[PDB]
mmCIF file of C-alpha atoms in Angstrom:
data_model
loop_
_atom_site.group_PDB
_atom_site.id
_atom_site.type_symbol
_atom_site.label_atom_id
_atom_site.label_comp_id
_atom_site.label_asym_id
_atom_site.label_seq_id
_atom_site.Cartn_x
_atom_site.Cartn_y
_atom_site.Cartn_z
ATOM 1 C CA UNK A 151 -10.815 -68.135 122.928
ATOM 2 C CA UNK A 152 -14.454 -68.782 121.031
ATOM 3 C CA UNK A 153 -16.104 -67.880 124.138
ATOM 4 C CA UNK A 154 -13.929 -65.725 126.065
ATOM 5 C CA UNK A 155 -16.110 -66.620 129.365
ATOM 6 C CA UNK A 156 -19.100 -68.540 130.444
ATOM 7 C CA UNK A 157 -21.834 -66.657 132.841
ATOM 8 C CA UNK A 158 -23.932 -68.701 135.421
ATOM 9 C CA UNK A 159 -27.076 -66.725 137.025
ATOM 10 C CA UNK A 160 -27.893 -67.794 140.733
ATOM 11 C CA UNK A 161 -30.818 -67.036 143.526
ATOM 12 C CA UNK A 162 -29.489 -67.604 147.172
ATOM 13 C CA UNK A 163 -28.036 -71.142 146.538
ATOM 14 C CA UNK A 164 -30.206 -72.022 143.493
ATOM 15 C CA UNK A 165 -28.946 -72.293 140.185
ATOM 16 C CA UNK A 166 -31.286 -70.503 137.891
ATOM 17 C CA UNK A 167 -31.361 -70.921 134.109
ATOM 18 C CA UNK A 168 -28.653 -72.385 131.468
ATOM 19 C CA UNK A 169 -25.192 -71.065 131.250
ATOM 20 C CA UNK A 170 -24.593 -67.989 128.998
ATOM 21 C CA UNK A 171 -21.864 -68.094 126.541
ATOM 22 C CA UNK A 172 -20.262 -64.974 125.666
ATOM 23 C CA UNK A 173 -19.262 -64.531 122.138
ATOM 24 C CA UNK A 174 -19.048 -61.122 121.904
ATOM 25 C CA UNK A 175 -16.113 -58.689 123.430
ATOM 26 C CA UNK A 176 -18.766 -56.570 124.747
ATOM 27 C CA UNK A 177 -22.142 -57.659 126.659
ATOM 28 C CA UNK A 178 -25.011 -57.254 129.547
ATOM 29 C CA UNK A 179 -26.874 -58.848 131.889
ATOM 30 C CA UNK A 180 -29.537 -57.412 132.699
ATOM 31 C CA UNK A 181 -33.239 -57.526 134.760
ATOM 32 C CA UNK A 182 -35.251 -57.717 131.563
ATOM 33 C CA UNK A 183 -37.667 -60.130 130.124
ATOM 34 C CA UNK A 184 -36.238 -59.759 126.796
ATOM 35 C CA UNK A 185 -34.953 -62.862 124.948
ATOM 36 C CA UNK A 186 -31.114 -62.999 125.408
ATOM 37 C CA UNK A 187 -28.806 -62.795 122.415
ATOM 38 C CA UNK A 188 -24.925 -62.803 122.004
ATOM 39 C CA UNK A 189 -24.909 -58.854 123.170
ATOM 40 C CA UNK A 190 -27.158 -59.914 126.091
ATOM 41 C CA UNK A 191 -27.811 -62.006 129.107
ATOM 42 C CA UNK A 192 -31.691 -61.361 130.619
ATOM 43 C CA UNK A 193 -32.459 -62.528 133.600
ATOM 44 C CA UNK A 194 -36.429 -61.297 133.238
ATOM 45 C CA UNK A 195 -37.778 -64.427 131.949
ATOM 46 C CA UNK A 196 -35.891 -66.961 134.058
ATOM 47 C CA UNK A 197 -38.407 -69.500 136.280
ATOM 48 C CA UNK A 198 -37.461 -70.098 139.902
ATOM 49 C CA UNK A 199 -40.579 -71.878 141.403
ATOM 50 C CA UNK A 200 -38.822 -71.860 144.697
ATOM 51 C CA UNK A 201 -38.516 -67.890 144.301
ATOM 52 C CA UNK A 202 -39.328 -66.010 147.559
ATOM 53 C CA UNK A 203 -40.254 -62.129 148.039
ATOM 54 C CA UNK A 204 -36.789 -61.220 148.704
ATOM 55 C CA UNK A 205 -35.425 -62.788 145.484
ATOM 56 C CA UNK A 206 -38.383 -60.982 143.300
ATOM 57 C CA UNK A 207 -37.823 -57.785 144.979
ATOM 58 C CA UNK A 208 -34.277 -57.852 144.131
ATOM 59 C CA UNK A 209 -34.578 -59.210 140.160
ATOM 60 C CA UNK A 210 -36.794 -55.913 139.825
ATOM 61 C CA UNK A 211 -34.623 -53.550 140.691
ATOM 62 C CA UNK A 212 -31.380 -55.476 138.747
ATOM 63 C CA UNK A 213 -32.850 -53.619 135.550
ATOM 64 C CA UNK A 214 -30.114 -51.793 133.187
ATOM 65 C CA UNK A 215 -27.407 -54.237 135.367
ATOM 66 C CA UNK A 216 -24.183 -54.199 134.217
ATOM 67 C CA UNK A 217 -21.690 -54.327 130.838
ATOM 68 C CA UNK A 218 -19.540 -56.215 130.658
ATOM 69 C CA UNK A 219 -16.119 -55.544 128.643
ATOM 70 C CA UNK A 220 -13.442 -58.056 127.015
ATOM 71 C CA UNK A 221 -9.969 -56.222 125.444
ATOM 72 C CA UNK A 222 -6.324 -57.385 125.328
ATOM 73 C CA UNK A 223 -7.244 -59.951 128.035
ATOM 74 C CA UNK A 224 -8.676 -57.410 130.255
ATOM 75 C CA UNK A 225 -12.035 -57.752 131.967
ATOM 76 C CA UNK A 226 -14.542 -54.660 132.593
ATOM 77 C CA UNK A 227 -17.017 -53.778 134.620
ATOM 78 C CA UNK A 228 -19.845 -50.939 134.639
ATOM 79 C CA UNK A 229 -22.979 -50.776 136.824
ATOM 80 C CA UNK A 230 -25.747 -49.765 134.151
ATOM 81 C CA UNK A 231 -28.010 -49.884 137.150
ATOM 82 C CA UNK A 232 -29.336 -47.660 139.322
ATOM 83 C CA UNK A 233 -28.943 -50.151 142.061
ATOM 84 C CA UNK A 234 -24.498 -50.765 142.973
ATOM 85 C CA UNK A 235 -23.066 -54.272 141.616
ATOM 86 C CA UNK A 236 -20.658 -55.940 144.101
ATOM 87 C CA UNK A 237 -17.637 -58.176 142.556
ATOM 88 C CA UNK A 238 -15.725 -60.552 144.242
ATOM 89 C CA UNK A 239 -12.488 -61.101 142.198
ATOM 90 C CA UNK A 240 -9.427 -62.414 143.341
ATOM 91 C CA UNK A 241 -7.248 -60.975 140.569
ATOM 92 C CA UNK A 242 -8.887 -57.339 141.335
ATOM 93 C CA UNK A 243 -8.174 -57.693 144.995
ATOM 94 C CA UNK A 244 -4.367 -58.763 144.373
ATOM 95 C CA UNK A 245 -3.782 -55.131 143.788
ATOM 96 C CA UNK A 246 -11.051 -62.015 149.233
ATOM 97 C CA UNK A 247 -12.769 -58.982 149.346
ATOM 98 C CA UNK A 248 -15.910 -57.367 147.446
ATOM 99 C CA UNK A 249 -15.378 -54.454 145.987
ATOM 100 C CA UNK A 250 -18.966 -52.660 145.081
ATOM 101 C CA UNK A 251 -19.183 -50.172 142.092
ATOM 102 C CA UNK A 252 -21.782 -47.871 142.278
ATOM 103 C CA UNK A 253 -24.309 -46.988 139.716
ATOM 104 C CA UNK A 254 -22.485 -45.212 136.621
ATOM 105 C CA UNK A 255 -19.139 -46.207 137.535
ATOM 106 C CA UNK A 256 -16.639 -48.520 136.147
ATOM 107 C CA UNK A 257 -13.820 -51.248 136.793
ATOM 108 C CA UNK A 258 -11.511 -53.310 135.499
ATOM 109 C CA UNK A 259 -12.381 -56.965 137.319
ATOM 110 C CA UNK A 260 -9.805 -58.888 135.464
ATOM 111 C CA UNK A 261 -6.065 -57.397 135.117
ATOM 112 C CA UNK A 262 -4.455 -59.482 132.314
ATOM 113 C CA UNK A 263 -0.951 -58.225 132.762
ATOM 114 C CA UNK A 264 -1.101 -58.784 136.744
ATOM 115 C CA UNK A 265 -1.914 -62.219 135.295
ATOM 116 C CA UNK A 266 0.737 -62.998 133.626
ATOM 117 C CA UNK A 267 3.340 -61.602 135.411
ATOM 118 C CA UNK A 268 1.839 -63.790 138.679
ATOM 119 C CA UNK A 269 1.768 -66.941 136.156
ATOM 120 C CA UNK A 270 5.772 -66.109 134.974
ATOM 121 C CA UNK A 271 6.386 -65.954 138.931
ATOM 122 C CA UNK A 272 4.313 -69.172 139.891
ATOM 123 C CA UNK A 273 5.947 -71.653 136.975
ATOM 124 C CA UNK A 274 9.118 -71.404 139.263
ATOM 125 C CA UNK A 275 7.052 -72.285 142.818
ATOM 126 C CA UNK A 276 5.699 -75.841 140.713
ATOM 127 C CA UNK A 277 2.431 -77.078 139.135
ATOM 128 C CA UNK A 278 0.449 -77.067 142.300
ATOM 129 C CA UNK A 279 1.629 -72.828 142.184
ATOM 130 C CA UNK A 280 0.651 -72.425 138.975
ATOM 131 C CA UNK A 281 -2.664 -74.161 139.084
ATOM 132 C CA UNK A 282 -3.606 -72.098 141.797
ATOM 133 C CA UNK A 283 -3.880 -69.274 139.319
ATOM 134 C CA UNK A 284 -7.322 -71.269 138.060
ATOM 135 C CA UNK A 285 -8.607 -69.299 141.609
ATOM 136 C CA UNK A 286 -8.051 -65.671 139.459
ATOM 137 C CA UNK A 287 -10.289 -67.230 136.371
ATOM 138 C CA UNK A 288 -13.321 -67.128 138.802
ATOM 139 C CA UNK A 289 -15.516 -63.759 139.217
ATOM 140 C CA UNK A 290 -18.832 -63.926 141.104
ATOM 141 C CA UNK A 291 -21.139 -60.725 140.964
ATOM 142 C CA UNK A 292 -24.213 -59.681 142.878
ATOM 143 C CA UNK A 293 -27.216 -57.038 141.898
ATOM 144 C CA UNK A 294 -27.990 -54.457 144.721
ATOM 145 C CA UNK A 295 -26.810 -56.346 147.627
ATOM 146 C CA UNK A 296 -23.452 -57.272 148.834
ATOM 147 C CA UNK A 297 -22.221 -60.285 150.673
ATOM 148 C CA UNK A 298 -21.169 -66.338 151.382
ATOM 149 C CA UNK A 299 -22.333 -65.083 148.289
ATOM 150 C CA UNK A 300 -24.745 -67.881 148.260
ATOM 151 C CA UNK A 301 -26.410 -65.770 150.883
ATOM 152 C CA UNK A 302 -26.876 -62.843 148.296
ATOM 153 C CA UNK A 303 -30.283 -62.719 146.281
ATOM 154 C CA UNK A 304 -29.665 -62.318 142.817
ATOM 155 C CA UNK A 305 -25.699 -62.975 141.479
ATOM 156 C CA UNK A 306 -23.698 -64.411 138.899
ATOM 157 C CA UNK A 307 -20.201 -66.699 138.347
ATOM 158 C CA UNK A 308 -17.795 -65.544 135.346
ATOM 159 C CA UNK A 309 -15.451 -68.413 134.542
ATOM 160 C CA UNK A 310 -12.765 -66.678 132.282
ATOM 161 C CA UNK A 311 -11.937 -69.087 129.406
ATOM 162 C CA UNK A 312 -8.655 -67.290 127.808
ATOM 163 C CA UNK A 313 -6.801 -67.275 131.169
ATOM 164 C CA UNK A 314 -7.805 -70.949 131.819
ATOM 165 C CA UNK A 315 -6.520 -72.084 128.551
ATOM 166 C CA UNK A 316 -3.179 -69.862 129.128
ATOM 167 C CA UNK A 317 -3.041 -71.974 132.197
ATOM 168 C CA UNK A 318 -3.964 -75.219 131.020
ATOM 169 C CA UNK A 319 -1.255 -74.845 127.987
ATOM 170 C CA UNK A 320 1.394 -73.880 130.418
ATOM 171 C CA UNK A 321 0.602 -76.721 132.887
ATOM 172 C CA UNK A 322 1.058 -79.062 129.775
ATOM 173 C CA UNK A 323 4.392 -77.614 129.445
ATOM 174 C CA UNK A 324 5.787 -78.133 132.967
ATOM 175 C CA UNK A 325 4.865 -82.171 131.983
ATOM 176 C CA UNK A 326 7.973 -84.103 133.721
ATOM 177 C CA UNK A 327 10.782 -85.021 131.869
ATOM 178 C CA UNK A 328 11.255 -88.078 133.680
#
């Protein structure tokens, strides 16, 4: 995939800034006021004029954030910052909850061969099954605090392309004979 996922920054329930692209297998987002890049997502100089205390407090201690990681289909996760991360992924918790990685630490958000072996499985329960599997494509992060996650101050929504066009190519597949 060109873009092997698409990043979305939030603030409580407000949608803050355009949509990052990620081009490159490796990337952060971070606190900073630096101009993002393809290596780089900063939240620093993102507006909110509807920003409250809470929100600002937060953003400043975000800072080093986290890396992100893209190989063989895999997803990765490291907290750069000294303040924990908190991911809710569906595909991590098939081995709805939020698991929180702590400053320093590492883990692997997206399981690629889970995937697959769940998208083998599902072709057999129908289209509705394996479109289901669109669920496991969606990661939603938060800086410092944990959670709705709409509820959270600072977080962020992965949509991960390659997995959505496996799906969407195997969905055109089980097209009905008729």
């Amino acid at each position: 995939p060109a873009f092997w996922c698409s990043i979305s920054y939030y603030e409580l329930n407000q949608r803050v800034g355009e949509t990052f692209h990620a081009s490159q297998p490796s990337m952060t987002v971070d606190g900073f006021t630096d101009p993002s890049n393809s290596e780089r997502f900063c939240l620093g100089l993102l507006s909110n004029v509807n920003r409250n205390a809470a929100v600002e407090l937060t953003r400043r201690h975000i800072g080093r954030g986290v890396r992100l990681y893209y190989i063989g289909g895999e997803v990765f996760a490291e907290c750069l910052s000294d303040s924990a991360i908190f991911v809710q992924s569906p595909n991590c918790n098939q081995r709805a909850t939020v698991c929180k990685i702590p400053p320093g630490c590492n883990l692997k958000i997206f399981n690629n061969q889970e995937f697959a072996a769940l998208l083998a499985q599902s072709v057999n329960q129908g289209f509705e099954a394996v479109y289901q599997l669109t669920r496991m494509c969606t990661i939603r992060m938060s800086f410092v605090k944990g959670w709705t996650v709409t509820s959270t101050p600072c977080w962020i929504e992965l949509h991960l392309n390659g997995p959505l066009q496996w799906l969407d190519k195997v969905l055109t597949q089980m097209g009905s004979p008729s």
